Structure formats: structure tokens, C-alpha cells
Scaffold this active site. Sequence first.
Site, PDB file in Angstrom:
ATOM      1  N   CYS A 144       1.444   4.853  -1.827  1.00 27.27           N
ATOM      2  CA  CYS A 144       2.840   5.239  -1.797  1.00 27.27           C
ATOM      3  C   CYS A 144       3.366   5.235  -0.367  1.00 27.27           C
ATOM      4  O   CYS A 144       3.550   6.289   0.252  1.00 27.27           O
ATOM      5  CB  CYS A 144       2.984   6.625  -2.408  1.00 27.27           C
ATOM      6  SG  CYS A 144       2.347   6.735  -4.101  1.00 27.27           S
TER       7      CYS A 144
ATOM      8  N   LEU B 138      -1.057  -1.606  -0.629  1.00 23.70           N
ATOM      9  CA  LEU B 138      -2.088  -0.994   0.194  1.00 23.70           C
ATOM     10  C   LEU B 138      -2.307  -1.776   1.468  1.00 23.70           C
ATOM     11  O   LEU B 138      -1.806  -2.914   1.599  1.00 23.70           O
ATOM     12  CB  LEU B 138      -3.398  -0.995  -0.578  1.00 23.70           C
ATOM     13  CG  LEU B 138      -3.341  -0.179  -1.859  1.00 23.70           C
ATOM     14  CD1 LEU B 138      -4.471  -0.579  -2.764  1.00 23.70           C
ATOM     15  CD2 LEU B 138      -3.413   1.273  -1.525  1.00 23.70           C
TER      16      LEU B 138
ATOM     17  N   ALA C 250       6.147   0.509  -1.400  1.00 24.67           N
ATOM     18  CA  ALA C 250       6.295   1.171  -2.688  1.00 24.67           C
ATOM     19  C   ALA C 250       7.646   1.905  -2.799  1.00 24.67           C
ATOM     20  O   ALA C 250       8.340   1.771  -3.799  1.00 24.67           O
ATOM     21  CB  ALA C 250       5.134   2.120  -2.940  1.00 24.67           C
TER      22      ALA C 250
ATOM     23  N   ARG D 244      -1.801  -1.954  10.499  1.00 27.02           N
ATOM     24  CA  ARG D 244      -1.145  -2.995  11.319  1.00 27.02           C
ATOM     25  C   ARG D 244      -1.405  -2.841  12.837  1.00 27.02           C
ATOM     26  O   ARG D 244      -1.421  -3.821  13.564  1.00 27.02           O
ATOM     27  CB  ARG D 244       0.364  -3.074  11.034  1.00 27.02           C
ATOM     28  CG  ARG D 244       0.734  -3.596   9.615  1.00 27.02           C
ATOM     29  CD  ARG D 244       2.259  -3.757   9.464  1.00 27.02           C
ATOM     30  NE  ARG D 244       2.681  -4.209   8.133  1.00 27.02           N
ATOM     31  CZ  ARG D 244       3.081  -3.414   7.134  1.00 27.02           C
ATOM     32  NH1 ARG D 244       3.132  -2.083   7.276  1.00 27.02           N
ATOM     33  NH2 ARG D 244       3.443  -3.960   5.981  1.00 27.02           N
TER      34      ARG D 244
ATOM     35  N   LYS E 239       1.141  -9.311  -1.071  1.00 30.30           N
ATOM     36  CA  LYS E 239       0.619 -10.261  -0.108  1.00 30.30           C
ATOM     37  C   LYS E 239       0.242  -9.489   1.151  1.00 30.30           C
ATOM     38  O   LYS E 239       0.700  -8.365   1.333  1.00 30.30           O
ATOM     39  CB  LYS E 239       1.681 -11.326   0.219  1.00 30.30           C
ATOM     40  CG  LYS E 239       3.142 -10.829   0.320  1.00 30.30           C
ATOM     41  CD  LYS E 239       3.381  -9.750   1.406  1.00 30.30           C
ATOM     42  CE  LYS E 239       3.144 -10.287   2.797  1.00 30.30           C
ATOM     43  NZ  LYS E 239       3.169  -9.245   3.831  1.00 30.30           N
TER      44      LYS E 239
ATOM     45  N   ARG F  47      -3.470   7.841  -0.513  1.00 31.36           N
ATOM     46  CA  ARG F  47      -4.445   8.491   0.380  1.00 31.36           C
ATOM     47  C   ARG F  47      -4.084   9.959   0.658  1.00 31.36           C
ATOM     48  O   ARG F  47      -4.945  10.824   0.530  1.00 31.36           O
ATOM     49  CB  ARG F  47      -4.636   7.709   1.698  1.00 31.36           C
ATOM     50  CG  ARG F  47      -5.458   8.464   2.785  1.00 31.36           C
ATOM     51  CD  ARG F  47      -5.620   7.624   4.056  1.00 31.36           C
ATOM     52  NE  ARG F  47      -4.322   7.233   4.615  1.00 31.36           N
ATOM     53  CZ  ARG F  47      -4.136   6.353   5.595  1.00 31.36           C
ATOM     54  NH1 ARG F  47      -5.164   5.741   6.168  1.00 31.36           N
ATOM     55  NH2 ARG F  47      -2.905   6.091   6.009  1.00 31.36           N
TER      56      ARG F  47
HETATM   57  N1  LIG Z   1       6.611  -8.478   0.247  1.00 34.79           N
HETATM   58  C1  LIG Z   1       7.063  -7.819   1.331  1.00 34.79           C
HETATM   59  O1  LIG Z   1       8.351  -8.044   1.852  1.00 34.79           O
HETATM   60  C2  LIG Z   1       6.218  -6.793   2.046  1.00 34.79           C
HETATM   61  C3  LIG Z   1       6.809  -5.952   2.999  1.00 34.79           C
HETATM   62  C4  LIG Z   1       6.094  -4.858   3.503  1.00 34.79           C
HETATM   63  C5  LIG Z   1       4.789  -4.624   3.056  1.00 34.79           C
HETATM   64  N2  LIG Z   1       4.218  -5.467   2.125  1.00 34.79           N
HETATM   65  C6  LIG Z   1       2.855  -5.248   1.647  1.00 34.79           C
HETATM   66  O2  LIG Z   1       2.717  -3.979   1.018  1.00 34.79           O
HETATM   67  C7  LIG Z   1       1.431  -3.440   1.299  1.00 34.79           C
HETATM   68  C8  LIG Z   1       1.604  -2.063   1.935  1.00 34.79           C
HETATM   69  O3  LIG Z   1       2.412  -2.193   3.092  1.00 34.79           O
HETATM   70  P1  LIG Z   1       3.317  -1.008   3.704  1.00 34.79           P
HETATM   71  O4  LIG Z   1       4.139  -1.609   4.745  1.00 34.79           O
HETATM   72  O5  LIG Z   1       3.882  -0.280   2.523  1.00 34.79           O
HETATM   73  O6  LIG Z   1       2.289  -0.146   4.589  1.00 34.79           O
HETATM   74  P2  LIG Z   1       2.087   1.433   4.448  1.00 34.79           P
HETATM   75  O7  LIG Z   1       3.401   2.101   4.632  1.00 34.79           O
HETATM   76  O8  LIG Z   1       1.071   1.851   5.428  1.00 34.79           O
HETATM   77  O9  LIG Z   1       1.622   1.656   2.929  1.00 34.79           O
HETATM   78  C9  LIG Z   1       0.252   1.732   2.608  1.00 34.79           C
HETATM   79  C10 LIG Z   1       0.061   2.899   1.657  1.00 34.79           C
HETATM   80  O10 LIG Z   1      -1.256   2.886   1.124  1.00 34.79           O
HETATM   81  C11 LIG Z   1      -1.830   4.174   1.290  1.00 34.79           C
HETATM   82  N3  LIG Z   1      -3.285   4.096   1.390  1.00 34.79           N
HETATM   83  C12 LIG Z   1      -4.046   3.792   2.497  1.00 34.79           C
HETATM   84  N4  LIG Z   1      -5.347   3.818   2.132  1.00 34.79           N
HETATM   85  C13 LIG Z   1      -5.418   4.140   0.813  1.00 34.79           C
HETATM   86  C14 LIG Z   1      -6.477   4.312  -0.070  1.00 34.79           C
HETATM   87  N5  LIG Z   1      -7.727   4.178   0.341  1.00 34.79           N
HETATM   88  N6  LIG Z   1      -6.235   4.623  -1.381  1.00 34.79           N
HETATM   89  C15 LIG Z   1      -4.941   4.786  -1.815  1.00 34.79           C
HETATM   90  N7  LIG Z   1      -3.890   4.628  -0.948  1.00 34.79           N
HETATM   91  C16 LIG Z   1      -4.127   4.309   0.340  1.00 34.79           C
HETATM   92  C17 LIG Z   1      -1.218   4.641   2.593  1.00 34.79           C
HETATM   93  O11 LIG Z   1      -1.629   5.968   2.906  1.00 34.79           O
HETATM   94  P3  LIG Z   1      -0.905   7.398   2.760  1.00 34.79           P
HETATM   95  O12 LIG Z   1      -1.088   7.974   1.372  1.00 34.79           O
HETATM   96  O13 LIG Z   1      -1.595   8.263   3.793  1.00 34.79           O
HETATM   97  O14 LIG Z   1       0.578   7.292   3.033  1.00 34.79           O
HETATM   98  C18 LIG Z   1       0.229   4.240   2.361  1.00 34.79           C
HETATM   99  O15 LIG Z   1       0.837   5.075   1.419  1.00 34.79           O
HETATM  100  C19 LIG Z   1       0.748  -4.414   2.264  1.00 34.79           C
HETATM  101  O16 LIG Z   1      -0.181  -5.224   1.583  1.00 34.79           O
HETATM  102  C20 LIG Z   1       1.865  -5.276   2.802  1.00 34.79           C
HETATM  103  O17 LIG Z   1       1.435  -6.580   3.135  1.00 34.79           O
HETATM  104  C21 LIG Z   1       4.913  -6.527   1.619  1.00 34.79           C
END
Ligand SMILES: NC(=O)c1ccc[n+]([C@@H]2O[C@H](COP(=O)([O-])OP(=O)(O)OC[C@H]3O[C@@H](n4cnc5c(N)ncnc54)[C@H](OP(=O)(O)O)[C@@H]3O)[C@@H](O)[C@H]2O)c1
Lengths: 325, 324
Positions: free
Chosen positions: A11, A75, A15, A171, A98, A38
Amino acid sequence: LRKIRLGIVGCGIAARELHLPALKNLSHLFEITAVTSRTRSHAEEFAKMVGNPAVFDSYEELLESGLVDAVDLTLPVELNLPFIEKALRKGVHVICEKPISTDVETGKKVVELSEKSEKTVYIAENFRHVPAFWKAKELVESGAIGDPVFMNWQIWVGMDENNKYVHTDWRKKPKHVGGFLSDGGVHHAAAMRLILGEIEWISAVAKDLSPLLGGMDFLSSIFEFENGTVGNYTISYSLKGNERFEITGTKGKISISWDKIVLNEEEMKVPQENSYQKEFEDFYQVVAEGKPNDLGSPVQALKDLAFIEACVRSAGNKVFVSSLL
Amino acid sequence: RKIRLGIVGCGIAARELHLPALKNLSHLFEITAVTSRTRSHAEEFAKMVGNPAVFDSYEELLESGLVDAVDLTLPVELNLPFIEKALRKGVHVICEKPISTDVETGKKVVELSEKSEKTVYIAENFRHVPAFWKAKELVESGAIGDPVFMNWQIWVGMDENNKYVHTDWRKKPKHVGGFLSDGGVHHAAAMRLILGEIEWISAVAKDLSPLLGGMDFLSSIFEFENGTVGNYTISYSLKGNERFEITGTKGKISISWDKIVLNEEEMKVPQENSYQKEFEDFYQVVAEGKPNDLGSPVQALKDLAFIEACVRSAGNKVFVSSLL
Ligand SMILES: NC(=O)c1ccc[n+]([C@@H]2O[C@H](COP(=O)([O-])OP(=O)(O)OC[C@H]3O[C@@H](n4cnc5c(N)ncnc54)[C@H](OP(=O)(O)O)[C@@H]3O)[C@@H](O)[C@H]2O)c1
Ligand SMILES: NC(=O)c1ccc[n+]([C@@H]2O[C@H](COP(=O)([O-])OP(=O)(O)OC[C@H]3O[C@@H](n4cnc5c(N)ncnc54)[C@H](OP(=O)(O)O)[C@@H]3O)[C@@H](O)[C@H]2O)c1
Ligand code: NA
Ligand code: NA
């Protein structure tokens, strides 16, 4: 219309900001029934935005709860592979962000799990659903500029200290090939492949120009498509400037933007759409209505990643993209 | 006193580019001798000059005692032998770019240049264009910070109506990459003047026009010895708009014949005739002891070498020094 019971895993930014608003527009197709992260408080805040899904301390528990038909993984990319495998082992569909994985050797493992399972693995490459790119594709494929000769895409993101993506742990210390080059690069490869087809070889130079952005953040490349078209793709994640995305053929030219295509002197506005919404619709049709998986295909995403991984390791040497696959 | 100058090869460049420049430099040049492959073209050119002596052959003009120097405006295949003949008679040479047909042959021009006391000036007029000079100074003075990326995209769009396209030695090129080296040496010259020497290129060359002899499209990536990355793409047959941009850590310049845009801000570039400027430089070299920095064959060889590397590349990494 039966709904897909969906579990949100991770989340964070995507998300909350990208997936949920699209999902909220598709409540006739999806119900969010479970949530896990997490940090528990992050999952709880997300739960409130949704309504009242069940909140789990772990993904493995979510998977075993019986509450979901599929899961949405947003994630750190290091987690895609093991989490996809966990879902398929429990007989649950997966939509996953992705890049497909951290690199091509790991990506290939996602692909083979996908191909051996009856459940759907859908890698959510939203650039495959962007209408501007489809419209460019149509113009090109119908002969509007004649034979494509040369495309150039120059992107200057100008990310600074106030950009939210810059501050995420996975990142800052990237495990993915080329850092931001893969993170944003898979989008660009997706688009170029959609419009012009597969790439044969690349030659590229990648640099690390900002201490603010984990890993490499500048890339300049030439390549040739299998059809004979020459490409230039240059991007800086840290420096400022104007995007140009141009395709020149034997009979004329197109310039491509989010909101319009210009064909020689002629403007055509592209009606705007939510690509995240569009990809969730497509995933619904794959899962529920038996539509083939062209656009969420793991193989497609692997090819996107391969283009970038080739550029990262080129150091100006010619790399035949096939050799990574 | 004035430099006695003989014109050799009375084609396009001689009438249209060189003569007007010399006519404005009549206080530094007198045209005394003229010679061409077709005697009637030489006689027409003579009528345009005043009353110079018309010779049936280069060799005779050289033995006539009427010239201090010669101006070679010839098919590039003739540069090496004609330069050698002139230096062997005690006659300075100003010669048009490219220096020769290829690097191997170019080196022979350089080698002869260093061994004679007479000057050999390869007239690379792009080294005399003020827009490039002002861009150099801005980059050198730190106006855009550390240079990161330059992009030059050129779309010449030549057609049946362009006169260069119908000249025999361009239709069946003997020079490396046809139009790619013909026009390319100019671009290498401007790139080298602004950002310095190039370490390596990787490039793809196509032959897209049945009308243009040899290859006519080129796209390349390269890295200067200072670390700047470059892209240089040209089509000689297709239309489009020129952009010439250099981005740094601190800013952005965009370059044009008449102006340089630094970030948001325009500065008009005062206009000059680059041919006129290069003849003045050649005057200063032979009469006034000015070192030959701008018309030196070594510089012209490096221009050709950039393009020759790009033609050999086929996408592979070519280290330019390996050609020299
Ligand atoms: N298509 C697009 O335009 C686009 C744009 C941005 C991102 N993305 C993709 O979306 C994904 C996430 O990116 P984001 O930017 O949302 O980064 P982010 O804000 O860091 O989101 C990652 C989430 O996963 C949680 N997490 C980390 N380890 C975990 C685990 N072991 N088990 C369960 N949850 C865990 C994080 O921790 P916490 O619970 O501590 O918060 C955070 O909530 C990536 O693969 C990225 O490539 C795609
Ligand atoms: N710096 C620039 O902006 C630029 C621009 C254009 C050209 N150039 C250079 O200048 C040179 C001339 O090119 P151009 O465009 O003027 O081509 P061109 O019109 O074909 O000029 C060549 C001239 O030399 C004559 N010639 C050929 N063989 C000869 C020989 N054996 N002995 C004496 N004369 C001979 C030609 O034949 P005829 O006597 O039958 O007419 C013609 O007059 C080239 O090296 C070119 O690269 C430079
Ligand atoms: Na970095
Ligand atoms: Na051609």
C-alpha cells in the site's frame, strides 16, 4: 457480471494514487476484499480509503484466507518473482506492476511460472494502453508517413528533491538493473515496440549524473528495429528540458504527445483516457471472459526489460537484444 | 603585397562561394591564373574575374611563374595528387574539404604538409562560422555548467533541383560514405570546435535515395574525451527541422546560423562570410606568420575520421584514434 475479488499487496504510492482511483471507477468488475502491507498502519489507512476490506499482517495469510480471486502487487520490484510464485501456488491470479523483475534472468523465471500455470499472470505495463501510442501505431501501420525511417524520443524528467518516488527505499538503493533506467525505461520500450515492433540491436551509453537518484539516471542509445527503422532514445531522469517524440518516414512525419499527434502540418487531438483503468479492464477480460493475454503478457514485459538491460550493459557496444532472451 | 592566386576547378564552389569572397578581398588577392577540365568553363570563370591567364592544364599553370598559391576546388579524389604537385613546385595550396577520399589517403596529405615549408590549408569554412565560436565561448565559460548531452539533427532535403546532386564525382562517389563525408566533415568540425575531440562513436548508415550517390542517411551516438555524450543524425534526402542543442548540468543552449538561445534568452549572432574569413586566415598564414590552427590538415583529417568511423561502425563501437 460476477466480480473479481481482489487483494491489494503493498500500500504505497502506486496503490493509493494510481491503482485505487482506477479501481474505484471499475467497481462493477472488482471488489477489494483484502489488503496487506509491510507497515500495518499504512495498510489500515489504505483500508479506510477503500471502505472495509480485511487487513492482514502478511501476504501469505491473505493468500490463504479464501477472500480473493486475484491479487494486485504494487511492491518493490525485488518481490515480484517470489510473490507471483506464492500466488500461483495458492491458485490465485496476479496483476503485477512493471518492471516484470529486477533483471532478465529473474524475469525469465516469472515467464516460465506464468506459462506453466492455469492462472493469469498479468504484468501491468500501462503504456500498452495509452491511446496516443495506439493512434501513432495506426498512422504508421497504414502508411501515413510511408516507410518509417527514423524515430527519436528525448525525455527530460527533471526529478528533484521534492519528487516522492526519489525517497522510496528500494529506489534509493536499487536492486533493479540500471536503477531509474529500468523503472521508467520499460514504459518507453513498451511504447516503441507497440508502434514499431521488435528491436534487433542497441548500442547505448548509461551514466550516473545525480547523487539524488539511486543508480544510473542518464541513457543515450541508438538501435534498429527488425523492420529496418533506426531509433534514438535519450533520457535524463534528473535534468530539465522538452520531450520530443518524432517518427520520420519516406513520405512525411509525426510528432507524438499525451494529448495529440501531429501528422506533418495536421493536428489530431487524442481523447484522454486512464491507462491504469484500461489495463484493469483488460485483466478482467483475460481472467473472466477468456480474452488472450497480449498486453499484460509476461513475455512482452520481459522484452521491455531486455531492451533496457541491453542499453545498461552496452557501454556503447552493439548488443543484439535476442541474446538476452 | 598581394598573394598571386590561381583557381583550379571552375565549378559551383569556385563561382558561387569562392569568387564573391575573393572579390571582397581584392586588397589581399589577385587572381592571375585559371584552369579547369573543360576549357570553356574556365574561360567563363575568367570573364567573371577580369582577365586572368587561362591554362589548358594544372601542370602548366604551376610552371608559369604567375602564382604564389593555388585554390583547389576539385573532385575530392584529386586533392592528394594536386597538393603534391603544387608543393613540389614551391606553391602554397588552399584546398577544399574534405581533405581526401578516406583517412588512409588523408594521412598522405598531412604527411606532405608537415614536410614542406609551404602552407597547405584545408578550407573547412565551418571553423570560421561565428555561431559556433559564440557557442564554444559559452560552453567554455561555464554558461551551462558541465556539458552533458549534445544533439544535432539535420534534414537537408536535397532534390533534383539542387545542383550538387548532378556533379559526376558525387553521383558515383569515390569518397567514404558519399554525401556523408561531403557534408559531414563540416559537422565534425563544428562539434570538435565546441566540445573537443571524440573518443568513440557507434553509428548506422543507410542509402535511402536513388538520387544521391552512395549513402545518404546517418545516425550516431558518441562520447567526447571530456565525457559529453553526442547524437548526430543526418538525412541528405528527407525534410525536417534542424535542431542543434547542448544541455548541461546548469542550463541549455540551442544553436542557429543567426542566434544562440541560452535557456530562455536570445543573443543575435553577428553575421559573417565564412569563406571570406577563411581566406583572410590563409592570407595571415602565408604572409603574416599566423600559425595554421584553423585550416590545418590535421584538423581536417580528424573531421574525416569522425565520419569514416561512423560509416565503418555498423552499430559497433569504433574508437576514432584507431583510424589515425
Ligand atoms: N505503472 C506506473 O506508472 C508505475 C508508477 C509508479 C510505481 N509503479 C510500480 O509500482 C510498484 C510500487 O511502486 P511505488 O512507487 O508504489 O513504491 P512504494 O511507494 O515504495 O510502494 C511499495 C509498497 O510496498 C510495501 N512493501 C515493501 N515491502 C513489502 C513486503 N515485504 N510485503 C508487503 N508490502 C511491502 C511498501 O512498504 P510500507 O508498507 O512500509 O509502506 C510500500 O507500501 C513498483 O513495482 C513500481 O515499479 C508503477
Ligand atoms: N566548403 C563548402 O561549403 C563546400 C561547398 C561546395 C563544394 N565544396 C568543395 O569544393 C570542391 C568543388 O566542388 P563543387 O561543388 O564545385 O563541384 P563541381 O562543380 O563539380 O566542381 C569541380 C570542378 O573541377 C573541374 N574538374 C574536374 N576534374 C578536373 C581536373 N582533372 N582538372 C581540372 N579541373 C577539373 C570540374 O569539371 P569541369 O571543368 O568540366 O566543369 C568542375 O569545374 C569539392 O571538393 C567540394 O567538396 C565545399
Ligand atoms: Na544516480
Ligand atoms: Na543514396
